[PDB]
Design a protein around this nucleic acid. Structure first.
Ligand SMILES: [Mg+2]
Ligand SMILES: [Mg+2]
Lengths: 132, 62, 65, 189
RNA sequence: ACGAGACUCUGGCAUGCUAACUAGUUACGCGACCGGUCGGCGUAACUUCUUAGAGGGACAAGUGGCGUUCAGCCACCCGAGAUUGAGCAAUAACAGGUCUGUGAUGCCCUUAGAUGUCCGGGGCUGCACGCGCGCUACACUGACUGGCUCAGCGUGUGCCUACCCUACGCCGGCAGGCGCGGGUAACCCGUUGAACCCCAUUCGUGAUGGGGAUCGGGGAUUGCAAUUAUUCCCCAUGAACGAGGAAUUCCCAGUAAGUGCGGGUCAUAAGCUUGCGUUGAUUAAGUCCCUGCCCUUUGUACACACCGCCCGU
């Protein structure tokens, strides 16, 4: 069983969140970084922490991680999330509308809308799942 | 009935009172299109060949 | 760590009805050089140095000294 | 040019069983001078299939307490009876041993009932590795109790046992036990 | 937060560092035998081998699959190593063991023809029988007899305190005895010349040259006394036992098992125990079937808790 204990995992998470810039995908550089920025009284514990830091660096490389929260990374993440299409998906030349919502719009005083296309209603009143 | 071989395609699980049999899926060496489930007694792995003296029973699923 | 972080003593007390046994265990605080406690930290305790706040240089400035 | 002992080649040995080809190691990476290699084949599962078949036989010879760990004696007992198989048959002793392994391994046998049960037995198929293991065990046991309380030395009992198993004869203890197991599996089908 | 892990000791790797006449190795001289063999002699190099310090080294780290593509699992490369073995170990409990370890102990008992204390002699072993842990076997994969060749852990001269480990020489089948030295120990025993194993020999399938119980007669050693025979030696004697019924134990790799060796006990002494090497496997990489033990839901009229509670004549 190679399951890491909470000591290793919390230490690695804090180290990553604090020193994300200095870290990378290399175990042998990460362990030196950890031994420089932290006080780990054992070499085996240091190696375990560095190994989990390497694993988590690979994990953040292809997306986010529920434990880490890097302040600088969130800015770039929302920058990616700032995608804007050229044409708004809500700008449609013709939108289909049922007779009932057409009547509702007429009652709203918006019955002069031109983009509306009054589609035919359904025939069978079968919208319920059979019981049994 | 003749004796015919079958290659193991995937290890299904462990069965028996003491978990001594490996229930496995085997495809026939000649036909290559018909496959069955049999319990094999001993250490089994991917791709090894079991000689079936009887070759038409099916082991019970799970 | 039990061999240098906790100090233990066992004693007898002679009373009228017999002997009472007393055991005292003290867990010493971590003392860096000054004898109130052990110098070594607990092996499972990891301390992470707080990074100092730097300012990223916006433009390349060359300082001649 | 890696003949066993210093006399038995392997280039001519044909397994010709297909099923046990991957579990009898005799031919090119498993051609060694001696059936003694220390080796760590028990460390991980299935590795003993990489062990040469002659070394597996040698290891199986050290049995019944008084012979535990005496592997030099057993390599001597294999070197002899290879020298004797060659005299008796005129064929490569390695070929005789391989044929014996093929012939003496059961193909079916019975376990306790299927998924569960505590009354009868249910027939099942044998893994190739278990086939080879059981073949070696039966050949060694037959030799061992042929030599017990008899002027016939070991390395003579084992040679005749291997020869009979290669022939498929019913004079072999291993063949008798294999037939017994297979018949019981047949009855419990 | 405690426990688990972490931790400490220990096993493996380093031709990299530190450095050694209480460890060596190369080299060179001087010798002895036929360039070679010198645990023959001596002194430069140095640290591979030996010691023991510091540091390094492994993290599931790399690759490919399986997984919520997470936690992790499987396989493979590289690698000395991809799970070395121990030590310590929570809350809470047991009418578990120990008053026979104690100048640890409370209450009783006894205390001078003593349950205190010496001193003779017995006992603790006594043997129709039952039950545990074991040792040696039932042979030829072996006994015998010669020959050959490899360990490791370690312990050695004592407060009182008498009692150490032994090389070499001689005498004696032997067990032993007598002289001489070294060692308070990487200095001497010791280069620990272990056993199994290896090689050759004789036996020849039977209670046999297997096996060594029992028993007789001699000889030594330690002790103040050896008989109920301390131990050891010799020559005799030569039992059961031909692989063990129901029923059960311990075991997953340098492991089980064979095999010796040390420590303790020790005036005399290991079939015990605690350690150490040496030779070295078969099988498994799984499951709740047996045996337990955990949970979880459920029932209770229990709560001293099923060894409970409780009903009627
Ligand atoms: Mg169970
Ligand atoms: Mg009540």
């Amino acid at each position: 069983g190679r399951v890491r204990t909470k000591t290793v995992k919390k230490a690695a998470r804090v180290i990553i969140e604090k020193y994300y810039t200095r870290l990378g995908n290399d175990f042998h550089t990460n362990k030196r970084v950890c031994e420089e920025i932290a006080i780990i009284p054992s070499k085996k514990l240091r190696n375990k922490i560095a190994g989990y830091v390497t694993h988590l660096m690979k994990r953040i490389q292809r997306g986010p991680v529920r434990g880490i929260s890097i302040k600088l990374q969130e800015e770039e993440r929302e920058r990616r999330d700032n995608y804007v299409p050229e044409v708004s998906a809500l700008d449609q030349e013709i939108i289909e509308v049922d007779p009932d919502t057409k009547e509702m719009l007429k009652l709203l005083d918006f019955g002069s809308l031109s983009n509306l296309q009054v589609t035919q209603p359904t025939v069978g009143m079968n919208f319920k799942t059979p019981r049994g | 009935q003749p004796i015919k071989l079958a290659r193991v395609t995937k290890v299904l699980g462990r069965t028996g009172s003491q978990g001594q049999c490996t229930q496995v899926r085997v495809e026939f060496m000649d036909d290559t299109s018909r496959s069955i489930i049999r319990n094999v007694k001993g250490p089994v792995r991917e791709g090894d060949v079991l000689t079936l003296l009887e070759s038409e029973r099916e082991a019970r699923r799970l | 760590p039990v061999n240098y972080y906790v100090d233990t003593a066992v004693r007898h007390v002679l009373l009228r009805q017999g002997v009472l046994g007393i055991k005292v265990k003290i867990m010493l605080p971590w003392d860096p050089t000054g004898k109130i406690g052990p110098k070594k930290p607990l092996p499972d305790h990891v301390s992470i140095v707080e990074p100092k706040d730097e300012i990223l240089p916006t433009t390349p400035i060359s300082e001649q000294k | 040019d890696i003949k066993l002992f210093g006399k038995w080649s392997t280039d001519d040995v044909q397994i010709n069983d297909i099923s046990l080809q991957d579990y009898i190691a005799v031919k090119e990476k498993y051609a060694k001078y001696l059936p003694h290699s220390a080796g760590r084949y028990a460390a991980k599962r299935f590795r003993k299939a990489q062990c040469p078949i002659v070394e597996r036989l040698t290891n199986s010879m050290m049995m019944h307490g008084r012979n535990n760990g005496k592997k030099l004696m057993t390599v001597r007992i294999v070197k002899h009876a290879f020298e004797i198989i060659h005299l008796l048959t005129g064929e490569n002793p390695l070929q005789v041993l391989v044929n014996a392994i093929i012939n003496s391994g059961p193909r079916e046998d019975s376990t306790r009932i299927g998924r569960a049960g505590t009354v009868r037995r249910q027939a099942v198929d044998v893994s190739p590795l278990r086939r080879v293991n059981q073949a070696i065990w039966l050949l060694c046991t037959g030799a061992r109790e042929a030599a017990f309380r008899n002027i016939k030395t070991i390395a003579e009992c084992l040679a005749d046992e291997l020869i009979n198993a290669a022939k498929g004869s019913s004079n072999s203890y291993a063949i008798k036990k294999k037939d017994e197991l297979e018949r019981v599996a047949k009855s419990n089908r």
